[PDB]
Design a binder for this molecule. Sequence first.
Ligand SMILES: *C[C@H](COC(=O)CCCCCCCCCCCCCCCCCC)OC(=O)CCCCCCCCCCCCCCC
Ligand SMILES: *C(=O)CCCCCCCCCCCCCCC
Lengths: 389, 49, 146, 97, 194, 217
Amino acid sequence: VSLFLMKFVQHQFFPSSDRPELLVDLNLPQNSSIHETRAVMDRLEATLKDDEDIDHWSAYVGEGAIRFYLPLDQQLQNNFYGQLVIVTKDLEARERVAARLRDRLRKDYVGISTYVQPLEMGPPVGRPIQYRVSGPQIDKVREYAMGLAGVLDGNPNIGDIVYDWNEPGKMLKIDIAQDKARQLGLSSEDVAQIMNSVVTGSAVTQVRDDIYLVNVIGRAEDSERGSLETLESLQIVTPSGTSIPLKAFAKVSYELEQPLVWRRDRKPTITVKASLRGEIQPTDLVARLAPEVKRFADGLPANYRIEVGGTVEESGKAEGPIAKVVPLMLFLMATFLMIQLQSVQKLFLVASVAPLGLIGVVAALLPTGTPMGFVAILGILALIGIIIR
Amino acid sequence: MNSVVTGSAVTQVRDDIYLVNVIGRAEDSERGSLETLESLQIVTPSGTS
Amino acid sequence: MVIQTRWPGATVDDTLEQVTDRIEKKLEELDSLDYVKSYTRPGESTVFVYLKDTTKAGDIPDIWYQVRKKISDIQGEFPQGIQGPGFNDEFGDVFGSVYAFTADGLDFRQLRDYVEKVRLDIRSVKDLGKVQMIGAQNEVIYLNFS
Amino acid sequence: DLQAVNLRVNDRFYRLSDLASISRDFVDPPTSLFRYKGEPAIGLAVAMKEGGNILEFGEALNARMQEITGELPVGVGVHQVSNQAQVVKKAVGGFTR
Amino acid sequence: YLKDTTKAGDIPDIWYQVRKKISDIQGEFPQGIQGPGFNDEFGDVFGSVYAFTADGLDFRQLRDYVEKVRLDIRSVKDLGKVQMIGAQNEVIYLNFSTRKLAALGLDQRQVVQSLQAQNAVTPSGVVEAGPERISVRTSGNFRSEKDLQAVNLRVNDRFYRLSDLASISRDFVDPPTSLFRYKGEPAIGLAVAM
Amino acid sequence: CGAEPPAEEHVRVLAQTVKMAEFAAEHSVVLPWSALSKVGEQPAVWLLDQQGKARLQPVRVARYASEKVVIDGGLEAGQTVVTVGGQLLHPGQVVEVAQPPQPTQSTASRDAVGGGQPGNSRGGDEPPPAPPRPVLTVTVKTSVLPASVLLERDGKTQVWVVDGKQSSVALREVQVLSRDERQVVIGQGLADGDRVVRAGVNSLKPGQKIKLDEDAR
Ligand SMILES: *C[C@H](COC(=O)CCCCCCCCCCCCCCCCCC)OC(=O)CCCCCCCCCCCCCCC
Ligand SMILES: *C(=O)CCCCCCCCCCCCCCC
């Protein structure tokens, strides 16, 4: 019955860190000027500026520094990533400061991805639950990621799911026939020159005002640059002194293009990360949702593929050599015992006690509902040794 | 002398993941074999030959 | 391992397909590597290298040197865009207390200068590892023409 | 130093101001911003030299900080963050307990 | 060739020493190209090689298919090095009608400079004109033979088409330097290492 | 052993009905710049059904988008199209009530919220006693002074600190309206010790002593 009941026993690879520090991350729907990120930042700051357990709190617009080797850090995702570190007095959950912040962001503006985070002890694992979908074609992998998240959201024990780089950007395409150019007295050379003077002027030498260096940059007049609305029907000047409206242009229009991609292993892919609810462990949830999602994956061209992105991968990688190493040591200690004894009968006799000890290890674990800890996965061997002793 | 052996070099092109470097050169009706390279009425930048 | 690479503006698709793809393909041949995380932006390329968590420590610098070698030669093929390996190793491992110097109604320049003076005076302390500032400001000079 | 640059005679030697607008130096569109208690600031992270005996480096550091404060000019607010020396102290204390 | 009396393992150190000794001295050579080929010979083991014969098609598309094969191969469990052979690098000759060029009073060097200034300009760039991220993109840079066949010049420079002045030779493969052949027939092999 | 997960919560969102407008494009449709998503090989948006669910509708945008995307074609007169997206479930999505003008208190939080006491800032609270900072020692026998030096807050903190031998306080409450945010010029109420600190004004307590030894290298 013990080995039988072992099935629903939940396992977890690592607990969190009791450090009184806490962090929160935010991601905007689409990439905008960093000014918008700072706007959301200052608003959230003005919201939390006077309360107990609220002290030593700083912001991060575009990048988060590193305290210890505990977490990772999104390097440069200014237009899509922010950070806020806060220090509590005795416990981040003392008054459930994290829950209060969750309610705050809930009442806050919509379409703003946000996530709370208590420091974690152990090798970095990023989000607790993720999934990676591959595809050599943009729209194909996108629609498939959508069709996957649809089935994934079946179980309501997950708070929310978030895709990756699943949004395009307003691109402006322009081109010229060059016939009217030579007709009006314009050459491709001056064409490119003007085009440069409109976006980013030419570069010149730097200056040495102090130990630092400042590079000066040229540019045309700004009374013709700054906003797209004013860039409509532009009477562009010519090097010959003349000025003609932009009517000589063509195909000037709006298009869509996602400015962020992930060519994991030289192949485009998307990473869908999801928050949790209740109290279950990501491993158990993965095991539960394994069949249906597997069938869904099967229902797709072979050139595509899906993989998990949670913590099961890391746990398995860590326990990898364990299985391929421990039995040898088992036979080693067995022979060691046979040294003191002289009969296989007594050997098997004392050996019978070894496995039977798994009674208490689970009896004192099921009522408490404590997940199977890795440390326990290790200590059980010490238990075997002492009981055999 | 350069336009006769190997013309000047210009910018490369990006037609695909690879790069193709274009090269200039004079007219080939005056290059290719040594026999024809005998008694060459070489042109001058001033139009003369 | 983090490897950054800039470019003076170009269509993100072409940017990746040209610089990122070549870097990834060339580096792929490297041994003992497991994950090759690509990262693209309008004009930035970033490569994340993750080796297998099965190798011994100590020789890690050798692998880093191998990476530097593999990219040094191939560098002679990229276009005129900038390029430089960011961190062969992540020195940003330990960090003691950090100190913020708030101020208003003054020169950010003089602020950074004071911070540098602080660094010089700090060097006098007994033991010191790395000292790194943040949020620096680099003033530029635009020259608009009539 | 560049506003009064001339040109050639046949080039109509004029002042840069007389021809273009010499925009005063200014900070570019930010790419990384730091902020303390909702207020802009500039932090400085320091690392302990490898092999350095911790719990003492911080002592000498804070002492030197006190001296620096003694020399801190006008309009300067020093704020310490992540004083791990205290963290380690409390940790080892509870451990030994 | 080092002496066959040293221990293994430290060989990379010797290679690094070589790289060091040449790095500094590099600052003295003339404008000629230079690059250390192999600090070590990675070409040690090689599993089966595969030749992909074909005729009546593009060598370009052939290499593209081989690259697609490489990408699909990466899916295999273990992989060492993957190297192709006998690749083709098409070039583009631009022969000029020197006589007519001189007749027009100009020289091809000026055309070279103009084309350089035209190609060195990126046809796109981020603008962020509004709150959201925005960027512009034009179609004016050289990307093919036709992309340069219709280039003009200045008024005082007799703005004409390249065809009207020079012969835009279609891209073609250069005089070979390394040729592969299977059963007396041209092909392209692919060596893979474990 | 087994618990109960919480109920499902519709993903909060702020949409808006469809109202044909002649915004310069007959019967054109305008919306904020953050309400466009590419589907297949064309732009599109999300429309919300009356029975609390979301669906995708392909569109064909032709008009320029200057912070406000303007499309023409594929519309439903009086349909609540999304204007906040980027993370919704493409196949179907149970949406949250977006009917309020601002279902978020952000429409008034910018001015005032009302939860608890306000935060802190230099100029309203008392700084802790610290060693005397080497004064700015900008005093010169006298005029104009950079606006950064003076830190007058609501007229209750005129830079009264005297630049003399003690760094005391004085009765210098002269206020000139020539406030061009660049320099303050006064004709009366000026003296030799009239100047004050540049940045450490509000962060300094009145009458606090200073030190003559200044940092320089
Ligand atoms: C973790 C698990 C669940 O806790 C429970 O207690 C579940 C039962 C629901 C509560 C009802 C309590 C029963 C009352 C007992 C009678 C009085 C006892 C009072 C105590 C005396 C002390 C003085 C106050 O707890 C467990 O460890 C047991 C779980 C084992 C069962 C798991 C179910 C999995 C599938 C079972 C297959 C059944 C096969 C037979 C066909 C139906
Ligand atoms: C599954 O996880 C079960 C949920 C119910 C938990 C109820 C709390 C159990 C604690 C048992 C302690 C008994 C003490 C008896 C004292 C006389």
